[PDB]
Write a protein that binds this ligand. Sequence first.
Ligand SMILES: *C(=O)c1cc2ccccn2c1N/C(C(=O)O)=C(/C=C/C(N)=O)C[SH](=O)=O
Ligand code: NA
Length: 363
Amino acid sequence: PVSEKQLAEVVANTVTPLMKAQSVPGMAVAVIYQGKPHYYTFGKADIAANKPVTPQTLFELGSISKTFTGVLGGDAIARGEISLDDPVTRYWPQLTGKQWQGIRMLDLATYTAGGLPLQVPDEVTDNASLLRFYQNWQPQWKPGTTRLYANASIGLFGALAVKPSGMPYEQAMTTRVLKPLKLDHTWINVPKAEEAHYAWGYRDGKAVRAVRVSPGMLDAQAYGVKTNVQDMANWVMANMAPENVADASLKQGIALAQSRYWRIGSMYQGLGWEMLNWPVEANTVVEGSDSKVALAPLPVAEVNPPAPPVKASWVHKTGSTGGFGSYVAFIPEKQIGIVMLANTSYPNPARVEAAYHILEALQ
Ligand SMILES: *C(=O)c1cc2ccccn2c1N/C(C(=O)O)=C(/C=C/C(N)=O)C[SH](=O)=O
Ligand code: NA
């Protein structure tokens, strides 16, 4: 029964040393505790302009954008528009290469298609060349046997998952996920009227921001999600407690995103989200966040059928861009969670260590 006064100290005593040690210009933190969000802001959103971080400052989520993709995909499944058991070719009949037989939407969504690479090559500058890329790809492993984190994998899942709806990814996300949850300050493309809240990212001392990719069915997702700490806190709350979400299919989509589809060592792969059974030790989580392991191709143990959301889980996702570093984690059983948005990409292990320390105090 930690008081708000104590929580404020715990956060300050953890984030302050962190920002100084990692040279973080600014950070927006939100802790979900006792049914509501608690906000703490530190530093600058724009160093040269001397603008401070506020609850309205927009940060780049990077790969945490994948959690929105997973939920949007879950929603489409709950609507009957797609099934994770359908072959990828059902949604893209032009993908005729036989190496695709046996590869399911589930494999694309969870990085198990057989070695799709981390990124889609820069040579891919339109849809005709994207098809060429997937047609030419030769898997290094059979489907459902190896997990290799890849934007070329989940990115395609996202583009194909919204096809039945008839809407482009950005529009489908806004209409079916953001608007319903009242995340009205979360964007792919920041409107010029909101640009004043857009923080600058920093890399080796230079102010930087994300750039757009070549027009295609993956361009919106590639551009990624931008949002403030309030919307992000509410995103965590909706995923933490889908029972409070009214829309029937979105509620189910949220559940599908936290379901366990594969076990890799001590972690479980969901749709976007990743999970570990709770209780879990800090070194298990921190050590798993190292790029050496996070990007390696590892063997998977199938969870068939998928295990529905386990309340006693540590649910999280890290994400970065050239100038931003973010992390989100929550434990449904305890109804506690945390969001940490920063405008500099610092080591993922430091993010995990800090988040764990703060939540450990609330447990
Ligand atoms: C997501 O944030 C993302 C997408 C890609 C594709 C290619 C290169 C970079 N990654 C990122 N971000 C990073 C990063 O630049 O630090 C990641 C690093 C890996 C790690 N665990 O250290 C992957 S992110 O955490 O999902
Ligand atoms: Na290439």
